[PDB]
A paper describes a structure:
Here we report the high resolution structure of MCD from P. denitrificans (PdMCD) that catalyzes the unprecedented α,β-desaturation of an α-methyl branched dicarboxylic acid CoA thioester. PdMCD forms a homodimer, consistent with our gel filtration analysis. The obtained well-ordered high-resolution electron density map allowed us to model almost the entire polypeptide chain (missing only 10 N-terminal residues) as well as the FAD cofactor in both active sites. Nevertheless, we also observed electron densities at the surfaces of each monomer that allowed the modeling of the adenosyl phosphate parts of CoA or its derivative. In contrast to canonical tetrameric ACDs, PdMCD possesses an additional ∼170-amino acid extension at the N terminus. However, when superimposing the PdMCD monomer with the MCAD tetramer, it becomes apparent that the N-terminal ∼170-residue extension of PdMCD structurally mimics the dimer–dimer interface of MCAD. By emulating the dimer–dimer interface found in the tetrameric ACDs, the N-terminal extension of PdMCD probably stabilizes the PdMCD dimer. The cofactor FAD binds to PdMCD in a “drawn-out” conformation, as observed for other ACDs. Both subunits of the MCD dimer contribute to the binding of FAD, which adopts a “butterfly-like” conformation in respect to the isoalloxazine ring. The carboxylic acid group of the substrate could potentially interact with three arginine residues (Arg-252, Arg-376, and Arg-421) that are all in close proximity.
The methylsuccinyl-CoA dehydrogenase (MCD)3 is a member of the flavin-dependent acyl-CoA dehydrogenase (ACD) family. MCD catalyzes the oxidation of the α-branched (2S)-methylsuccinyl-CoA into the corresponding trans-2-enoyl-CoA thioester, mesaconyl-CoA.
Numbering used by the authors:
A (entry chain B), B (entry chain A): 7 to 551
The structure:
Amino acid sequence: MPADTPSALLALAGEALPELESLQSRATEALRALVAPAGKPQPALLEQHQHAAHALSWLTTYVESIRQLSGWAGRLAEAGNLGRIEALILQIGLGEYLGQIAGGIPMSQTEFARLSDLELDWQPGEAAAKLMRGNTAPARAELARLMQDNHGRATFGATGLDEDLEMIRDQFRRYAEERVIPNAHEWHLKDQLIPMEIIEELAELGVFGLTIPEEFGGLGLSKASMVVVTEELSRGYIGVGSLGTRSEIAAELILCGGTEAQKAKWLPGLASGEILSTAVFTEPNTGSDLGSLRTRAVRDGEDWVVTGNKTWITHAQRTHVMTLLARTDPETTDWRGLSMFLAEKEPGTDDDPFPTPGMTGGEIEVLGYRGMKEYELGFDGFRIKGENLLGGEPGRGFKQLMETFESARIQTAARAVGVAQSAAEIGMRYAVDRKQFGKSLIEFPRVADKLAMMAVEIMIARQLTYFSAWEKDHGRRCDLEAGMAKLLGARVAWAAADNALQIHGGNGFALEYAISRVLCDARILNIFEGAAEIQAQVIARRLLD
Amino acid sequence: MPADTPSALLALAGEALPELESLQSRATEALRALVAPAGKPQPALLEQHQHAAHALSWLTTYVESIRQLSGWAGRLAEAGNLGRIEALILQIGLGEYLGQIAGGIPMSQTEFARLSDLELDWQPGEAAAKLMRGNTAPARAELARLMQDNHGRATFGATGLDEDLEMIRDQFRRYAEERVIPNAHEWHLKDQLIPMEIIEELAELGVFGLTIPEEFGGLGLSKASMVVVTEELSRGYIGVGSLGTRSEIAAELILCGGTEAQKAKWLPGLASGEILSTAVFTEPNTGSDLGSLRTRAVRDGEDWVVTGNKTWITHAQRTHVMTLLARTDPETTDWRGLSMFLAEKEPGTDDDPFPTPGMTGGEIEVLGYRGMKEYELGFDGFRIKGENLLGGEPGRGFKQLMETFESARIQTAARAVGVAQSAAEIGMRYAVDRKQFGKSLIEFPRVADKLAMMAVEIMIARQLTYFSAWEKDHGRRCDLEAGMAKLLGARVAWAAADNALQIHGGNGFALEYAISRVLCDARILNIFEGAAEIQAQVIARRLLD
Ligand SMILES: Cc1cc2nc3c(=O)[nH]c(=O)nc-3n(C[C@H](O)[C@H](O)[C@H](O)COP(=O)(O)OP(=O)(O)OC[C@H]3O[C@@H](n4cnc5c(N)ncnc54)[C@H](O)[C@@H]3O)c2cc1C
Ligand SMILES: Cc1cc2nc3c(=O)[nH]c(=O)nc-3n(C[C@H](O)[C@H](O)[C@H](O)COP(=O)(O)OP(=O)(O)OC[C@H]3O[C@@H](n4cnc5c(N)ncnc54)[C@H](O)[C@@H]3O)c2cc1C
C-alpha cells in the first residue's frame, strides 16, 4: 500500500500541489471575469454567480486542506513520528479530497462545488492521479483497525503539536472526563443550565483568562493553547467549550478596542470568571446582515438609553455584561452608524432572569440541549453609562467587532473539531461493543468506513485549525485560513454526528445515548456564529482581491 | 436546433440510457467476479467488498431513477403536459444524477459510490455528456421562480398520476392542512400521543382499510392510492402517515398468510379502525439480524406462552394486536424456527399502558416528536390463543413477513416523499417571507438552489415510488424497485430537511418552527424500517442473481 512508504507519499503530494494551486488560480480568474468584468466586483453579478463564487471558496478550502495535511505529515516525518495510522490518514485524505476536487465537493448535501461550475477542466498529472486512487478498501479497513487499537491516545493520529500543548490537552481531557461527560445527560434531562460549579472550576483553572495578558490577570497563553482547551471542553459538551470562547472573544474585543481605563476595569474580572459575558448582536429581523441592525442607543446627558429587540442570545440570564451592538447615528442604515457597548447588567435567577430596569426577556425552546440557554431580549430605555461605550468614540463598533473575527472563526473550528471527535469516539465505542450477525459492527465495512472517514476528516479540519492559530500566534493576517477551518470543520462535525448515529441504529435516537444530543450540537455549528453561506461569501470576496 | 427543449431533452435521454445500462451490467459482472468468483456468492467476500457491493446498489438506483424520470416526462409529453417546471426538473435531474454517476453518488455524507470502487471507467457519449451539463445556474433560478408561482398545487410539477389518484391527493392534503398541520406543535409541546380523534377521523375516511378488499369491509383501492394517502398524511406529520401504514401492512400479512377464519375475524376490524396493530419484531440485542431473535413461544395446551424482550415498538400502548415474531423451535438459531402471532392484547392508558397479564413495558425517551411513541416490552408467560398463530402452522413466520416487504418498502418511500415535500414547502415559505440584505432570501442562489434541488430530488423519488406501486398493482415482482425507492427517498428527505433548516438560520432550531421537528422525523427514515446499509445489501444480492 502507498502508506508503506510514507516518504514517497509525501514526495508525490509535493509534486501534485502546484497543479492544484494553478487550478485555484484559474478558478479565481474565471470568477473575476464573471463578477468583476470591468475590474470592480458588481453586487448583482456576485449574487447571480453565488454558486460559482462559493465553489471557489470550497475548492480553495480543499487545496489548503491538502497543503496542511501534507505539511502535518511532513513535520511528523522530520520528527520520526509519521507512523502507520498517520500515513494511512494521509493516503486516504489525499485520495478522497483529490477525488472530490475532480468529482464534486459537498457544500451541503445537495450542492456540489464542481470544476464545471466555473467552466474549468483538470487533467490530473501523474502524481495527482496516483494519489487520487488512495482511498481504498484495504486502507480504510486498516485505519479502522488501528483506531480500535488506539487505546491510550487522545486523537486518531498524532497531531504534531508540541509537548506543552499536548499536556494542556491531557489536562482538559481529564477535566471533561471527570466533570462534564458523566453529567451532561443529567443536565439535559433536567433542562438545566451548566452548573455554576463547573464555571467556578474552569475559572480556577484559568480558562476564562487563558489568552488575556498577565498584566490583566490572565495566563498570557497562545491562541493554539486556547484551541486545544476548547477542543477538549467541547468534546465533553459544546456549551462548556463555548463558556471559554465567550470570555476569550469579549476580552479580545476590549483589548483591541477599549480605552486603557476599560481594559483595567473589565479584563481582570473576565480573566477570573467574576465577570461573565455574552454577545448581544442578533435581532428578530437582522442576523446575517448585522450592519443593518435596528436597536438604537440615544444620548441622555453623558450616558446612553437603548431600545430594541435582540434574540438568539446565549447565556443571557447569568451574565454580568453584554457586548451590545447598537445604532448611535439615526441617519444611517449601515455598519457605519454602529457603536459597541459594554452593557453591564445584574445577573438574574430562574424566576427573575432580567431584573435590570429597561430589560425583559424569555428563554427560546431549542432543539437539543443548550446548556447556557438562548433568549429573546427586549430593551426599553435600558441605560448604559457613557464610560461603557467601547473605545469612547461612537461609530467604531463594527470595526471593533471585525477585529475579533479571526479568533471567533478559529474558536468555532475548534468547537467543531471537539464535537466531531466526540461523535467519532461514541461511534467507535458502539461499533465495537454492539454485536449483530455474530460479530461486532466494526467488522462491516459500512461501519468501519464511516469511522475511518471521520478520523481522516477530523485530522484535516484539525490541521487547518492549527495552521490558522499558528498564523494568528505570529501576528499574521489569517482571516481566510480561519474562515476555511470554520467552513470545513462545521461540515465535518455534522457528517461525523450523522454517521455515528447511523452506527447506533434505533438506539441513536434514544436520549439515553449521547449521540442524539451530539447530533443537535453538531448541527448548530454552521449557523450559530454565522451561516456557512455567508462564510463562503466572505472567503470568495477576499480571494478576488 | 436548441438542445434544451423538451423534445431535445427526451431524445437525448433516450440516446444516453443504453450506455448507463451497460455501465450497470459491467458493474454487476465486476461485483460478481469479486464476491462470487466460482459462482456462489461467498459471505466473507461479500463482507470484505461491502462498499463496492453497496456502490452497485446506489449506481443501479441512479440508473433506474434516470429511467423513471425520463419515462415520467415522456408520458407527460404524450398528454401535452410537459410544461416548463417539469422540463426543468427533467433537465436539472438528468444533469445532476449523470454528474454524480461520473463523480460520486453520496451513500452517506462521507461515503461515495464511485465507478472506481468497481474499477470501472466511463467516457460519456455525446448525448450523456450534453445532458450532464444541464444543472445550470439559470435553470435552477428559473425553477425556483416557478416554484414560487405554483397556484396552491400540491406538488412542484405534475405527477403524471391519473385523475382519480389526484382527487385522493386533494382530499388527504385538505385533511392534513385542516387537522394535522395546525395541531402538531401542540401535540409536541404536550408530549402526547396523536389524539384518538385523529384516529377516528382517519378511520371514517377509510384509511385503515384503503387497500383491504371490499368483502372484508375495506375500500379495495390500489397500492398507488395508498401511496398518495400516505404521502399527504406524512406531509402533515410522519406519524399520521404511519398509522395508515401499520394497518396496510398488518392486513397484507393476514391476507397473504392467514387462514380463511383469520381473514374473516381480523380484516374487518382493521379496515374500520376498531382494531389497531403494531409490529413486534425488534429485541434489545437483535434488530437487523431478525432471524436470530430470541423471544420464545411455547405450547400450553391449545395455546402458546411467550417469554422475551422486545424494543423500539411503535404505538404499543393503544394497540389491540401485535404482529409478534417469536421462536417456536428451541433447537434453532435462524429464521426457520420463527412463527408469527396475531397477539391480541388490551389497550392501555397513560397510567397503566400494559394491563394485559404477562406483559410489561415502558416508553423510550426519543429525540423529536414521536406521536405513537416507542416502547420497551417484556413478555413473561404472555398468553396467545392457538387460533392466533398466523396460518396455523409453526415455522412460517419469516416467509409470511417477507410477503409484506414490497409494500413496506413502498410505504416507507411514500412517507419519505411526504416528509421531503413538507421540508421543501416549509423552506419555500420561509425563503419568500424572510428578508435579509433588503430582499427575500429566495433571491440568493444558495437559498434558491437548495429549494430547486429539493423539487428535483422529490420528483425523482416520487417517480421511483410510483413505478414500484405500478408494478405491484399489476401483480409483478417489485422488491428491487421498491427497495431503491426506499433507499433514495430516505436520503432525499434527510437532505431536504437539513437544507430547509439551513434556510431558516437560527430559527431553524426553535421548536416554534416546524422544521426542527421535521429534521428529526426525516432522520428516522433510513433506520426505522431497517437500516439503509441492509437495504443496500439486499439490493446488491438480488442484482447478483
Ligand atoms: C444556538 C445559537 C446561539 C446563538 N448565539 C448568539 C449570541 O449569543 N449572540 C448573538 O447575537 N447571536 C447569536 N446567534 C445568532 C446567530 O448569529 C444567527 O443565527 C446567524 O448570524 C444567522 O442569522 P439569522 O439566524 O438571522 O439568519 P438569516 O440571516 O435570516 O439567514 C437565514 C439563512 O439564509 C441564508 N442566507 C442569508 N443571507 C444569505 C445571503 N446573502 N446569501 C446566501 N444565503 C443567505 C443562510 O443559509 C442563512 O442561514 C445564535 C444562534 C444560534 C442558533
Ligand atoms: C422510531 C423507530 C420506530 C421503530 N418501530 C418499530 C416497531 O414498531 N416494531 C419493531 O419491531 N421495530 C421497530 N423499530 C426498530 C427498527 O426496525 C430497528 O431499529 C432497525 O431494524 C435497526 O436495527 P437495530 O436498531 O437493532 O440496529 P443494529 O442492527 O444494531 O445495526 C446498527 C447499525 O449497524 C449497521 N449495520 C448493522 N448490520 C450491518 C451489516 N451487516 N452490514 C453493514 N452495516 C450494518 C447499520 O448502519 C445499522 O443501523 C423502530 C425503530 C425506530 C428508530
